[PDB]
Amino acid sequence: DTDYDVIVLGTGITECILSGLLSVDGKKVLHIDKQDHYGGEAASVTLSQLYEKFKQNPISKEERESKFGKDRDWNVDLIPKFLMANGELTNILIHTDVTRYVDFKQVSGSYVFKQGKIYKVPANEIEAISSPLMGIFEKRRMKKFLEWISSYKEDDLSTHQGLDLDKNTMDEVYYKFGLGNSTKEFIGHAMALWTNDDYLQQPARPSFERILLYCQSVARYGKSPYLYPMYGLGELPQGFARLSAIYGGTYMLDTPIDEVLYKKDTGKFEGVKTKLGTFKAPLVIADPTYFPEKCKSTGQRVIRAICILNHPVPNTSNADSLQIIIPQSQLGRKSDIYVAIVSDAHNVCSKGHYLAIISTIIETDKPHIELEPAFKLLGPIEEKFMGIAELFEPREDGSKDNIYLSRSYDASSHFESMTDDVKDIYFRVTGHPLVLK
Structure with a gap:
């Protein structure tokens, strides 16, 4: 033809x-x-x-196979990205039926960075009351917030709790529930997945929908969205x-x-x-x-650092896979830092090894140094493969x-x-x- x-x-x-x-x-x-x-x-x-x-000078086959194993065990995505379980793309992928060849497996965790450490993103009332992300009264506000997210019905006025998603900003929703600035940071950046704080002054509806999507996606298989x-x-x-x-x-x-x-x-x-x-x-x-x-x-230019580890990421309860979101204001940045972590559980590296891929939009003359806080989270790193791409x-x-x-x-x-x-x-x-x- x-x-x-x-x-x-x-x-x-x-x-x-x-x-x-x-x-x-x-x-x-x-x-x-x-x-x-x-x-x-x-x-x-x-x-x-x-x-x-x-x-510049790549190590020998013998070094590599003894240190890391055989190539057949390594499937390293240059730009790895995770799929929101209940999102639009899953519907799209199923529609095309590419899912008859491709087997999507659950990522084990979802984490957020706060003041030097990383914590599980609480996606249900139970997780909220147990979370070190929040003080004791905040824990209880967050539980109520998530109860609201789940109980809200557009056609049942009482479930609205005096709020409307079109006329109220998200900051006004947060105010209603009494939520502190750190809490709204992890909600906005790690649940709603906004890349900045602009959503604060915008109608709550889109924020509400993404947070609900996040929580529903976690409840699907139980570990992360x-x-x-x-x-x-x-x-x-x-x-x-x-x-x-x-x-x-x-x-x-x-x-x-x-x-x-x-x-x-x-x-x-x-x-x-x-x-x-x-x-x-x-x-x-x-x-x-x-x-x-x-x-x-x-x-825009993006720096990506593909890191190899011989151990799981500290403070992740030996998770075989996870996302970390590092919200920008935690590092005085204009852009969040992202980390995807995958391992032999997804068959992208050899047994006992982990891939930790760090990415952010560059805002300094020294991009590799922008990633230091993220490097610190991983513990000892065996090798880094770092590149810069213009968008x-x-x-x-x-x-x-x-x-x-x-x-x-x-x-x-x-x-x-x-x-x-x-x-x-x-x-x-x-x-x-x-x-x-």
């Missing part, structure tokens, strides 16, 4: 989901990648590959490649774009020229690396040229902003919001 409905460029997660969505929608999708492996700018790599990428695939996120592009074949799709790896074809007068997308031929479609979905002149910097966004929404571009993957250790981008790109491409039919 030479003519398709959609051409997609890159097999980063955002592209894979969209081409997956379009294929199950009955569209005919040619999906190409210039790279000889899946994952785009967010590939999954073996431990040996990890050394080649980040280390977060999911992570067995063998890690590298399973997803592989699963989307399979899913494509079923819908008459072609995932063309190792195929660079020699030239992009444009229509004469209008300047809209026409197709691409490859070593395998010339292929045409009315529209293209691609990542920023395929059209850098049609993308712009956000001004890009499209210059246009693609309505003028039929070139629909994704955003670079940001600092968060969870999938919310990625899901926002998928929904937004889908709307731009199809002219309507995404509905799961």
Whole structure:
């Protein structure tokens, strides 16, 4: 075939989901990648590959296999992110049926940083009354707050407790319940998953919904609200490649774009020229690396430090996996710091080893030093693999040229902003919001 409905460029997660969505929608999708492996700018790599990428002089095979074990046990996501169990993305992933290949397993814990230590995020009334995050009266306010979150019904006025989610700000909701500033910090940053404090002066409704989502997601399997695939996120592009074949799709790896074809007068997308031929479609979905002149910097750079440990993270009750959220005001920062922790329980490293991946938006001339507080939380660290990436966004929404571009993957250790981008790109491409039919 030479003519398709959609051409997609890159097999980063955002592209894979969209081409997956379009294929199950009955569209005919040619999906190409210039790279000889899946994952785009967010590939999954073996431990040996990890050394080649980040280390000037990588250690010998014998050192590595004795210290850390064999490559076949290591599936290290470059940008690992967790899935909110009851969130929109889970619904999206199930809709596409990529979940027939990918097995999402519970992350064991959810933690928040306060004044030098990390604590479990209390997601039920029971956890609230036992939490060292709060003083004794605060414990009891938080229990009442979570009782309210769970008992609120839009159509039952008495459950509202004098508050309305449209007219009251979240700060007014907090005031009602008597909640201190530290408490609202972990609610806002670690339950509602806001990245700053702007939500304080905005209607409570969106805050209410995200907190409820958080609590409902924990209650699902019992340990945390977060999911992570067995063998890690590298399973997803592989699963989307399979899913494509079923819908008459072609995932063309190792195929660079020699030239992009444009229509004469209008300047809209026409197709691409490859070593395998010339292929045409009315529209293209691609990542920023395929059209850098049609993308712009956000001004943002992200530092990621992939750390290897021989022991679990201190003060996590030997959790096999967890997220830590470090709220910005705890470090006098403009940006939260994120930590994703996974281990052999998810089959991404060898037995007895842990992966602790730290990420944040850089705000100083010394990015590695911004992460010191996060490094301190991990105990002895065997090796760090640290990189900096600049974040890009499209210059246009693609309505003028039929070139629909994704955003670079940001600092968060969870999938919310990625899901926002998928929904937004889908709307731009199809002219309507995404509905799961």
